Design an enzyme around this catalytic site. Structure first.
Site, mmCIF file in Angstrom:
data_model
loop_
_atom_site.group_PDB
_atom_site.id
_atom_site.type_symbol
_atom_site.label_atom_id
_atom_site.label_comp_id
_atom_site.label_asym_id
_atom_site.label_seq_id
_atom_site.Cartn_x
_atom_site.Cartn_y
_atom_site.Cartn_z
ATOM 1 N N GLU C 43 39.105 74.279 29.430
ATOM 2 C CA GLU C 43 39.648 72.927 29.451
ATOM 3 C C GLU C 43 40.878 72.799 30.347
ATOM 4 O OE1 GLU C 43 38.290 71.964 24.785
ATOM 5 O OE2 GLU C 43 40.368 71.593 25.415
ATOM 6 N N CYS C 324 47.516 64.298 17.879
ATOM 7 C CA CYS C 324 48.113 65.408 18.598
ATOM 8 C C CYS C 324 48.913 64.907 19.800
ATOM 9 C CB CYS C 324 47.042 66.377 19.064
ATOM 10 S SG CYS C 324 45.941 65.610 20.238
#
Lengths: 144, 350, 350, 350
Positions: C43, C324
């Site tokens: 990622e 988050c």
């Protein structure tokens, strides 16, 4: 203790207005005895004996006054506790000499300040009747 | 062995406490760092904190009562300061010392009012002219006016390096702040020295013996993880007195009930609706009433575990309390408007 | 060289995490002290704290899941406690410990609910009888009732120093708190001894294996600038869980926008006007929703750098978030009344 | 000895201060942690904390002023950062440092705005890429983009490890971030190193000269009772800038009056009744106006000893203040409506 020398020994300094005195006890000069001789209001001829009391920590602490000779005054209680600002803290200053403390009270006698009366009683009887006071006082003055 | 365990008896708290704690110290003082568990002689029960809390309140109460004369009180500031006249009281001073320390280790905040100088001295820093501002206000004003005077000091106030400290019956004793204070006259050139010496005597010298015992007692429980690791003294006051937290939400939760109220109840719901809309001063009045103070323990008001117990049917009596258990005794009034009027006259009265 | 730098892959987070962190310790432990930079394998992206935050949320979520069997939950109090039964899990206990440590160091508060005893044991204290009050309420109620019994134990109760620990199928295993428990009956004279052993066993001896690992891990990161220098354990909880600050003003400033809203905007101002007038419980629900929890990091809410972005035109959908990233996705509704009604059903639903 | 003591002259404050603090450090450096008494040469009076606050404000006002060119200001974030061009200014940086430290020890909060990296560097940590976010918003976005570039660097961008640093007149100076920057071009495989080096430079090397001096100063006071024992940097900012406590009750008490106002007085009661019903933003506006800031000192608003003095009879003038003494000069307006209207326009205007 110390300073009570020069101020007091400064009595021969002319004849002030309304005050005969001396040390009631005679020993450690921290308690004075005296007489304030008013001149105008109902307290007209009928002197009063006063006892001054300043703490060992004088002049950093203010002295306290207590009437020995009963009086019919608004700004004073039966117990004799006087309430003159010049000494009651939040005013007190180290340099103000006892010449001011007396005299100041003499003025509080010759002219009551019923603003914050140490006895609401005589206050009202004083403000809403400068007669039913002068009579009922000069008659308390003449007797006591 | 868990817990310190102080077994004392009301009417001899101070005494049995000293005897007891003294010994426990002698043998592994560490134990003075464990959770405090209190036992009143002849009282079955389990100390879940309240007995301990009671203990604290009582010792604190007795010690700061003029009767025993260990501390003088100042109407003006609502603070106490050490009495230099306190004779043969080393044990007593050491005791509130040990006590103040235990209060911190048991997350139990005390109702003590000291001028900030006390906490500075606990950290070893001596007291000073500025510190007098809060401990002896009248004396500070004088001294400040001394330094601020424009006129001629020597002739206008003629005071000397000698001073005096009296007691009770007007019997002054003389003290020399410098060698022959008697002579050496205070002037505009030495007025500062004078103020320094006079400030020193008063805050440090005159109350040495008693404050030192006090500090020794505080320290018997504070060594190791000291006040050091803390910049200013205000940090120590906060550990002893609590913060000024007013969560109340959260104080609502953790709240328990007894007498048949429970979470759901008209008297209860009306109560929270009243409390919440209160004005900070009131919210603090309620705390001061229910608990023994208007501040909060570490962790916020939630840690208080307040208990609302039904105390009789509707009446004209004001609610009451057992502060050492944060118990609010609430009669089941017939009206919300009456709940608020009675609760108010209660927390406002005293 | 910057950042702690940790790389793992969803599906194996705990494992990949453990190995690497472990190595990193053995080779220069002080690195466990730097700024945590997380990277999920495969990622691209830059971790500005968000990826770190997701990492924390995921590790914490999987460790407290019953599936893994490391902690038991109590519906009554909403707190987790160690599970004595957890077999072959030294690694995992060693991991959250490390995680809690890392959280403190990166000012990222976690959603963990432990009874105070966990923090006291992290500071080296044995757990005791009073501690059971939060960790084991009914057990605590039983032993209190035993200690408070006014009648006569032994003659009225049939218990000894031999106590049971039952498995999840009702199979009891006998455990002797003392030499020949079977024999030695519980009396009014030895009940305090009994209560302290039944407490020691439970809070310490029985979760020894899992606790000591939990701690080794926390200390690996904590090793230096210790929890010492901290009187109570509640200071450890605060660093990990956040304070109860509710500034909100300040949360307003430092807030950024995306999607074309900006400081000046009908919906935005309507938003703020709505949020401030909220009721503390609501204000906390708005945090719980947007950010992962209802508390504040060191520095207050303003340090949360919330972001409010446009999520399409007026609709009937509720707003959403990426906790988050403390990102609030606000649909540009057509009414302040609609904003408040949708936003409320959103933070109140979950 | 509990006193520190500083004698300086307005119009030479910085120099006279440096010379004296420097000398006091040499002789016993512990004195720099004691109670500060400032004296301006030729001005009678006593320092009760206000002359001390004046000294702090003035030093802070002159040091952050563009004229002396030590700190540059960012219109966008309202934060100051060190100026790499400040020439022959070790003395000046050393002084703010000392002052910042003195402030903490006399519990006097300052109106300073530093990006969070200054506090990290004060704690021994190098400034890093994540830190550029707050200290250099634009530069940080560039670096992020570069890192996030999906295309192919080198071929798409014409940059090397040679970067530029311009003066106020567009005169660029080249700086190699590594050996032969000129040559070695930035590729997708070496950009991360590029970014860390370019961050090191800027946050640390770039400002080594003046930041060195700043720290020496802060540490002269700060040494031995470290920022260590403090996890995150937000803690040092709290100590220097104050917490966001808004007691106000408590602010009321401990307030004093001058000019003849006293606790009881129609103008004063109307005033508090206005203040208490203020909206926090306003409550903060009032603090910013009366005192130099909108935050609170250790101990809460109560430790501010705010004074309200009569400043004439009713008029149309707005109240004013002497922040260094926390003095609010209040003209005795003829009506509550008017008190509130003039107070508001005053604290809101500036």
């Amino acid at each position: 203790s110390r300073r009570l020398m020069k101020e007091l020994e400064e009595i021969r300094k002319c004849g002030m207005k309304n005050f005969r005195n001396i040390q009631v006890d005679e020993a450690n000069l921290l308690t004075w005895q005296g007489l304030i001789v008013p001149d105008n209001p109902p307290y007209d001829k009928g002197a009063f004996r006063i006892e001054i009391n300043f703490p060992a920590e004088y002049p950093f602490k203010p002295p306290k006054i207590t009437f020995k000779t009963k009086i019919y005054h608004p700004n004073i209680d039966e117990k004799g506790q006087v309430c003159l600002p010049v000494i009651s803290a939040e005013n007190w200053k180290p340099a103000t000499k006892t010449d001011q403390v007396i005299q100041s009270l003499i003025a509080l006698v010759n002219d009551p300040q019923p603003e914050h009366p140490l006895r609401a009683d005589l206050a009202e009887e004083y403000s809403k009747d400068r007669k039913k006071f002068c009579k009922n006082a000069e008659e308390f003055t003449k007797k006591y | 062995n868990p817990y310190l365990r102080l077994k004392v008896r009301r009417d001899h708290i101070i005494d049995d406490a000293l005897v007891r704690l003294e010994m426990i110290a002698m043998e592994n003082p560490a134990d003075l760092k464990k959770q405090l568990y209190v036992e009143f002689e002849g009282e079955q029960g389990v100390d879940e904190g309240g007995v301990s809390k009671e203990f604290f309140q009582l010792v604190v109460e007795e010690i700061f009562n003029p009767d025993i004369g260990m501390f003088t009180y100042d109407e003006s500031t609502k603070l106490f300061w050490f009495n230099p006249s306190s004779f043969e009281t080393e044990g007593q001073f050491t005791l509130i010392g040990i006590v103040l320390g235990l209060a911190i280790y048991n997350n139990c905040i005390l109702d003590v009012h000291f001028p900030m100088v006390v906490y500075r001295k606990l950290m070893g820093k001596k007291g000073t002219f500025r510190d007098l501002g809060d401990s002896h206000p009248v004396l500070y004003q004088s001294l400040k006016d001394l330094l601020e005077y424009e006129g001629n000091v020597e002739d206008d106030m003629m005071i000397t390096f000698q001073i005096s400290q009296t007691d009770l019956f007007g019997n002054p004793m003389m003290y020399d702040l410098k060698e022959n204070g008697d002579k050496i006259p205070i002037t505009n050139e030495n007025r500062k020295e004078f103020v320094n010496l006079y400030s020193d005597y008063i805050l440090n010298k005159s109350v040495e013996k008693q404050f030192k015992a006090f500090r020794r007692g505080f320290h018997m429980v504070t060594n190791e993880s000291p006040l050091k690791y803390l910049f200013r003294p205000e940090e120590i006051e906060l550990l002893i007195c609590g913060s000024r937290n007013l969560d109340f939400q959260a104080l609502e939760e953790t709240t328990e009930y007894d007498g048949g109220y429970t979470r759901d109840s008209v008297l209860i719901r009306e109560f929270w609706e009243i409390v919440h809309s209160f004005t900070d001063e009131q919210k603090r009045l309620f705390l001061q009433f229910t608990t023994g103070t208007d501040r909060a323990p570490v962790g916020g008001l939630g840690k208080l575990k307040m208990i609302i117990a039904k105390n009789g049917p509707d009446t004209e009596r004001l609610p009451t309390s057992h502060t050492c258990f944060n118990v609010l005794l609430l009669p089941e009034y017939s009206s919300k408007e009456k709940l608020k009027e009675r609760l108010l006259k209660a927390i406002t009265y005293a």
